[PDB]
RNA sequence: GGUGAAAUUUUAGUACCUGUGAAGAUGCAGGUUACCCGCGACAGGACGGAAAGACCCCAUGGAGCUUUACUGUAGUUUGAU
RNA sequence: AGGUGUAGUGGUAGGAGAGCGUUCUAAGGGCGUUGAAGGUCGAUCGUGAGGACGGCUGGAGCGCUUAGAAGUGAGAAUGCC
RNA sequence: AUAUCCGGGAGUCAGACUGCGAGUGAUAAGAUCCGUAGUCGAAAGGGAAACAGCCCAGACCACCAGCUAAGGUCCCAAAAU
RNA sequence: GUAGCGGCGAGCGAAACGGGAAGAGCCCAAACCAACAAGCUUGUUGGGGUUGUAGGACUCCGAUAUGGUAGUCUGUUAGUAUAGUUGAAGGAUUUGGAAAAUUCCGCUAAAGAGGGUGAAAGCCCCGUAGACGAAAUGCUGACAACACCUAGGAGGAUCCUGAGUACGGCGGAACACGAGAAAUUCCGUCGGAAUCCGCGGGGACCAUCCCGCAAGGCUAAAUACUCCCUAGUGACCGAUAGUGAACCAGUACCGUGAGGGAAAGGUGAAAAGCACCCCGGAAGGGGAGUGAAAUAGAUCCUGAAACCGUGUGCCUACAACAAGUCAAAGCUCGUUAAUGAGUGAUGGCGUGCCUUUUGUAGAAUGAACCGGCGAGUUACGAUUGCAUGCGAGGUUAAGUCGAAGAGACGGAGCCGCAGCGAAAGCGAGUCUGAAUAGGGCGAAUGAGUAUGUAGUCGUAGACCCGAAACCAUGUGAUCUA
């Protein structure tokens, strides 16, 4: 028999337009522009789920570096000293101690400095 | 069976492949034809046996022989097929036709000595291979050219 | 419509018992002074259609 | 095998015996499926057509010059991408019928008949007699035999009044013993066959 | 004040320099400059618009033309009947 | 039926496999003026095509299961309207 | 842990750069033409400011966890002023 | 897709036999006879006669029967087409504007096909099954009438049996057959027979044998097609589809003309199509009404998107931004309740989609946007995979009956079971060869076939769109020469 276009076409395009809500001007309005930008958004979103892991480790290291220097030590020497002392605390936890519990961070720094001397 | 519970035998029926219905099907866009050229075109392609202008194989080779207007081809019956009849049977082109052994006798029945004959028969046929004649008579039967 | 046999091929090849094709030999028409006796003797013998060529011409002889 | 015999009044008389080659074989489900599909296809009429670009009215001339107008090149107003243009491919009148090998047809018919017996859906009656055709009476016979589901009533040739009285009931399908198809049998939940109809079937098969 | 088109147009929040890159980038890199919105003007750029380059090459494309190209042929002429 | 272990899982042309959705047919089983399809909205589900469930709109038809047949899926054709 | 062999289905016959070995060239060309290996093609990620073909390295997915490669550690900008 | 034809290319491509549908045979010319008319023949008429196991004339006898028909507005009769008649069985209840929906109990059915009715009805309507009906005019079939045909056997002395014909040369054509070794048929041209002791064909030609008897005509059925008419059917369309045309369409409109050729369906169950009032010149609104509903008010069902506007929760006047993405305060909100939603200062990262390319963000191509439409299909064949049935076997085709079905019958035919050889031919072998040799192809060392389904191919427009052009009928000198 004859199968006319029906409603499938509209349904499919409406899904893309919903993904494009909040985009500027025609990019949330017109299907072709919206689909092109949703594709680019997907490309960015996948790439950025990898990049966010890089960015946060970059943030923690910088914060640990600032706290390390306040304890008479560079970031690189502190991580060497913690490794020598068998401390497995990760950079997310160290950065959190650097900001929220400075006394605990100082206790870790002292253990690292002790391990470096030995 | 039930009309609301029909099921074909496994592997008896397959789904047709539709080309040019999107890229993820693997036959989207170019529909399996690749890129340009004569074979990408609608109705494109060269005739069977065309070698792009190299002299085709058949032109390279000589024509041979002729067909004989009077050529006679015989329907072949071997001895193993005559073991199907009981001892003393009269094996005839009519009998072989009724048995369904020889539906088309062509220029006639010819008997050949492929297998071993084990029953005594009086065999009637257009022609006999010398070996077939010996086997039939060695079995204590007899042959007759019709 | 029925597929048509390639008549020129049908005049040049024969279907053998194994389903292969028996063929004559090229270079068996003239200029025999240009060929050794060994060449003439061995071109006298028939050959078969090669695998690559057979796949190209097989449809043209389906009902030969 | 053996099947209970009923009279038109509904009391069970002694059993009868059916040929085992016809009603006793193991049903071949794949063969039945093939027969069902083929028969359904054979009923198709295939009267469907569309106009391709040559059949559509008009369209001979080239709409505009090949070059220079800035428009897409067009060869006819009836080209398929045009509104009102010819249809590309699409339905063309054709038959949908094909014939299975005879042996397969026979096996299919025996399968459905042997399946009805195996499920005890084959109710054999001595006879169905009516002085005059009356639906209410046949309806009462179906009640006599405790048949409330779709039934194929298989009558011997010449039983006009039984056929007349049965046919209007929405759950009844009437055939004669010599015109019985696989689709007829598979559709029915039950088969009601007179004794002479069963004998005729066994002579046909 | 009234009336009211058009070519064009992938979406555009549409700078400069040097560089880079399909080797000449408003959009990439680095740096520099730049508050938001217009109006009247000018045309350097958007390899601006218009036309599926006409030059050039190609397609065992097309057409018109020529001749001691090939093959035919109207006409003309000569003989036989 | 699942479990363990090891290994593997970028991809154009292209080959293979398995599915989603559309209209129609058959059978079965169902839903509809106590509101069908369609439209619209929502923060919903699945590995994907896609699938539900609610509110509103709407006013008559339409799902589901199994099988069948297909004018069966569009974003590009200086495509047509 | 592949090899052949038989058969169904293809696509491909514009390649590019880089290293190395040669020719052509002026031991010019992002030149041309072979051989040989790689990458691109058909490969995202990190480095080379940007930079298909170089260096490191092959993305089934999730993580605000860890270790490294090339390359890096004064600020932009993660890490030894 | 065989035999053949064929720049032996591309391609073209039979026929007879076998199986079916349907079947049916007959009249002339001539001899000869009779009549008439004319210039012993030489015409007209009527008789006679009709062919190949040769027939007929003729001469003998012997029967005026028996059979047949593709004759006629010859009537009579029946049927049938073209109007019609008749035709079973339901009320309540719940919901609703309305019941056919629902529930409850009933009933009718030779009718449960279908349509309509205020939603979906076997029982309300039109119908349906069934029964029934024709003044008139056709059509058909019989029957009758009438007309028209229809003689057996034996004899051969003689006579007849289609001439400028057959046939031949030359030039063309048709035969599947392209001049070919080219028979058979035909056309033009020229030449040109025999005639029963004859003539033609059997694929050059001759002999023999066999089969036929040209140069005269007619003939039902089986076959092709459907502008129209009647009744229906559809895994056909459902208004961008389906006819170009559902609508006042071959219309409007374009063109000198031939010719080209559109767009355009839907209020509601019923108009009950908004009395009256109010603003306005009107248009149009606001009330009031109608209605189940008028945001169903005629541009009228539903009413998407582009596009245009109004309100406003959050943000925005130091910023260079394919515009997103990841991180993120603040503010405003509260969900399919989910480690929620909207907005978003600020920070990191980041050159669209497609096509085509060695390589494109590309300063190459394509798209203004949105919506709809728009491209590997079908038929017949080839072949392979998968599947089913049967298996050294498998299977029917046309056709007949049958629902436009299944099925039954139908074995003609096709594939397979044996190959080898150019072929005669031999045969589990065979060909080559002097060969018991060697070698080629086969067997040893078996699986096929029917159908379905899918992949691919072939013939067809063959996935869709696009040339410049070519050819063949027509229309134009109202412009211009
Ligand atoms: K392919
Ligand atoms: K050959
Ligand atoms: K030669
Ligand atoms: K470029
Ligand atoms: K300018
Ligand atoms: K020209
Ligand atoms: K909804
Ligand atoms: K299509
Ligand atoms: K378009
Ligand atoms: K190289
Ligand atoms: K590689
Ligand atoms: K054929
Ligand atoms: K050729
Ligand atoms: K007569
Ligand atoms: K009704
Ligand atoms: K009458
Ligand atoms: K000839
Ligand atoms: K003959
Ligand atoms: K003859
Ligand atoms: K409405
Ligand atoms: K707004
Ligand atoms: K950002
Ligand atoms: K350009
Ligand atoms: K041998
Ligand atoms: K030998
Ligand atoms: K099989
Ligand atoms: K197959
Ligand atoms: K086509
Ligand atoms: K095709
Ligand atoms: K004039
Ligand atoms: Mg569409
Ligand atoms: Mg299919
Ligand atoms: Mg692919
Ligand atoms: Mg695409
Ligand atoms: Mg392309
Ligand atoms: Mg190419
Ligand atoms: Mg190609
Ligand atoms: Mg050449
Ligand atoms: Mg020779
Ligand atoms: Mg040599
Ligand atoms: Mg046309
Ligand atoms: Mg334009
Ligand atoms: Mg149309
Ligand atoms: Mg550069
Ligand atoms: Mg530049
Ligand atoms: Mg940017
Ligand atoms: Mg960048
Ligand atoms: Mg330009
Ligand atoms: Mg061009
Ligand atoms: Mg991987
Ligand atoms: Mg629908
Ligand atoms: Mg389509
Ligand atoms: Mg569009
Ligand atoms: Mg180069
Ligand atoms: Mg490429
Ligand atoms: Mg890369
Ligand atoms: Mg690229
Ligand atoms: Mg740092
Ligand atoms: Mg230092
Ligand atoms: Mg009534
Ligand atoms: Mg009721
Ligand atoms: Mg010819
Ligand atoms: Mg002749
Ligand atoms: Mg002549
Ligand atoms: Mg004879
Ligand atoms: Mg006729
Ligand atoms: Mg229309
Ligand atoms: Mg519509
Ligand atoms: Mg139209
Ligand atoms: Mg409304
Ligand atoms: Mg409306
Ligand atoms: Mg500033
Ligand atoms: Mg500010
Ligand atoms: Mg280039
Ligand atoms: Mg672009
Ligand atoms: Mg630009
Ligand atoms: Mg453009
Ligand atoms: Mg004129
Ligand atoms: Mg005039």
UniProtKB/Swiss-Prot annotation, chain A:
InterPro entries recorded: Ribosomal_bL20, RIBOSOMAL_L20_CS, Ribosomal_protein_bL20_C
Gene3D superfamilies per record: 6.10.160.10, Ribosomal protein L20
Record has Heme as a keyword: no
Keyword line: Ribonucleoprotein, Ribosomal protein, RNA-binding, rRNA-binding
Keyword Kinase: no
One Pfam entry name: Ribosomal_L20
One annotated GO biological process: translation
Gene Ontology MF terms: rRNA binding; structural constituent of ribosome
Gene Ontology CC annotations of this record: ribonucleoprotein complex; ribosome
Family (UniProt): Belongs to the bacterial ribosomal protein bL20 family.
UniProt function note: Binds directly to 23S ribosomal RNA and is necessary for the in vitro assembly process of the 50S ribosomal subunit. It is not involved in the protein synthesizing functions of that subunit.
Name used for this protein in its record: Large ribosomal subunit protein bL20
Organism classification: Bacteria, Bacillati, Bacillota, Bacilli, Lactobacillales
From Swiss-Prot, chain B:
Keywords: Ribonucleoprotein, Ribosomal protein, RNA-binding, rRNA-binding
GO function terms (MF aspect): rRNA binding; structural constituent of ribosome
Record's function text: Binds to the 23S rRNA.
Gene3D superfamilies reported for this sequence: 3.100.10.10
Region (Disordered): 1-51
Classification via PANTHER family: 50S RIBOSOMAL PROTEIN L15, LARGE RIBOSOMAL SUBUNIT PROTEIN UL15M
GO annotation, cellular component aspect: cytosolic large ribosomal subunit
UniProt keyword Lyase, yes or no: no
The UniProt record lists the keyword RNA-binding: yes
Pfam families hit by this protein: Ribosomal_L27A
Name of the protein: Large ribosomal subunit protein uL15
UniProt similarity note: Belongs to the universal ribosomal protein uL15 family.
Quaternary assembly: Part of the 50S ribosomal subunit.
Biased composition (Gly residues): 23-35, 42-51
GO biological process terms on file: translation
Compositionally biased residues, Basic and acidic residues: 1-10
UniProtKB/Swiss-Prot annotation, chain C:
Chain positions covered by the region annotation Disordered: 1-52
GO MF annotation list: structural constituent of ribosome
Pfam assignment, any one: Ribosomal_L35p
Superkingdom of this protein's organism: Bacteria
Keywords: Ribonucleoprotein, Ribosomal protein
GO biological process: translation
Signal peptide: none
Recorded GO CC terms: cytosolic large ribosomal subunit
PROSITE patterns assigned: RIBOSOMAL_L35
SUPFAM superfamilies xrefs: L35p-like
Extent of Basic residues compositional bias: 1-15, 22-44
Family: Belongs to the bacterial ribosomal protein bL35 family.
Protein known as: Large ribosomal subunit protein bL35
Organism: Enterococcus faecalis (strain ATCC 700802 / V583)
Lineage: Bacteria, Bacillati, Bacillota, Bacilli, Lactobacillales
Swiss-Prot record, chain D:
Keywords, ordered alphabetically: Ribonucleoprotein, Ribosomal protein, RNA-binding, rRNA-binding
Pfam families registered for this protein in UniProt: Ribosomal_L4
A single GO cellular-component term on record: ribosome
Region (Disordered): 48-77
UniProt GO molecular function: rRNA binding; structural constituent of ribosome
Gene3D superfamilies the UniProt entry points to: 3.40.1370.10
GO biological process per UniProt: translation
Taxonomy, superkingdom: Bacteria
Biased composition (Basic residues): 59-70
Family, as annotated: Belongs to the universal ribosomal protein uL4 family.
Description of how the protein assembles with itself and partners: Part of the 50S ribosomal subunit.
Function: One of the primary rRNA binding proteins, this protein initially binds near the 5'-end of the 23S rRNA. It is important during the early stages of 50S assembly. It makes multiple contacts with different domains of the 23S rRNA in the assembled 50S subunit and ribosome.
Name of this chain's protein: Large ribosomal subunit protein uL4
């Amino acid at each position: 028999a004859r199968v006319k276009g029906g409603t499938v076409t509209r349904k499919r395009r409406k899904k893309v337009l919903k993904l494009a809500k909040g985009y500027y001007g025609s990019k949330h309005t017109l299907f072709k522009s919206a689909k092109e930008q949703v594709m680019n958004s997907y490309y960015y979103a996948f790439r950025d789920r990898r990049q966010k892991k890089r960015d946060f480790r970059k943030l923690w290291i910088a914060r640990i570096n600032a706290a390390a220097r306040m304890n008479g030590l560079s970031y690189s020497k502190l991580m060497h000293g913690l490794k020598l002392a068998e401390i497995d605390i990760n950079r997310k936890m160290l950065a959190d101690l650097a900001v929220n519990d400075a006394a605990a961070f100082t206790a870790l720094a002292e253990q690292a400095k002790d391990a470096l001397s030995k | 069976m039930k009309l609301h519970e029909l099921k074909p035998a496994e592997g008896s029926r397959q789904v047709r492949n539709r080309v040019g219905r999107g890229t993820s099907s693997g036959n989207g866009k170019t529909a399996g034809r690749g890129q340009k050229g004569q074979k990408a075109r609608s109705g494109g392609g060269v005739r069977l046996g065309f070698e792009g202008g190299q002299t085709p194989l058949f032109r390279r080779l000589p024509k041979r022989g002729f067909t004989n207007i009077n050529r006679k081809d015989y329907a072949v019956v071997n001895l193993d097929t005559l073991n199907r009849f009981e001892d003393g049977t009269e094996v005839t082109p009519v009998v072989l036709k009724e048995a369904g052994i020889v539906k088309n006798e062509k220029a006639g029945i010819k008997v050949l000595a492929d297998g071993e004959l084990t029953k005594k028969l009086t065999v009637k046929a257009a022609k006999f291979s010398k070996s077939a004649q010996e086997a039939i008579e060695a079995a204590g039967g007899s042959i007759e050219v019709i | 419509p029925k597929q048509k046999t390639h008549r020129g091929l049908a005049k040049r090849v024969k279907r053998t018992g194994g389903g292969g094709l028996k063929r004559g030999r090229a270079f068996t028409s003239h200029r025999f002074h240009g060929k050794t006796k060994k060449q003439r003797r061995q071109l006298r013998k028939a050959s078969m259609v090669a695998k690559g060529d057979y796949k190209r011409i097989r449809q043209q002889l389906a009902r030969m | 095998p053996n099947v209970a015999l009923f009279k038109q009044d509904g009391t069970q008389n002694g059993e009868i015996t059916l040929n085992e080659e016809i009603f006793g074989i193991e049903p071949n489900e794949s063969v039945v499926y093939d027969a069902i599909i083929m028969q359904r296809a054979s009923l198709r009429q295939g009267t469907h057509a569309v106009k391709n670009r040559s059949a559509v009215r008009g369209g001979g001339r080239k709409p505009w010059r090949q070059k220079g107008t800035g428009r897409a090149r067009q060869g006819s107003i009836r080209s398929p991408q045009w509104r009102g243009g010819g249809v590309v491919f699409g339905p063309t009148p054709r038959s949908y019928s094909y014939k299975f090998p005879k042996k397969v047809r026979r096996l299919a018919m025996k399968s459905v008949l042997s399946d009805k017996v195996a499920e005890n859906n084959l109710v054999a009656v001595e006879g169905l007699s009516f002085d005059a055709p009356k639906t209410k009476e046949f309806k009462q016979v179906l009640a006599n035999l405790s048949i409330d589901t779709k039934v194929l009533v298989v009558l011997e040739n010449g039983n006009d009044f039984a056929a007349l009285s049965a046919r209007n009931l929405p759950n009844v399908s009437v055939v004669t013993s010599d015109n019985v198809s696989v689709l007829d049998v598979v559709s029915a939940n039950k088969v009601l066959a007179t004794q002479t109809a069963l004998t005729q079937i066994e002579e046909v098969l």
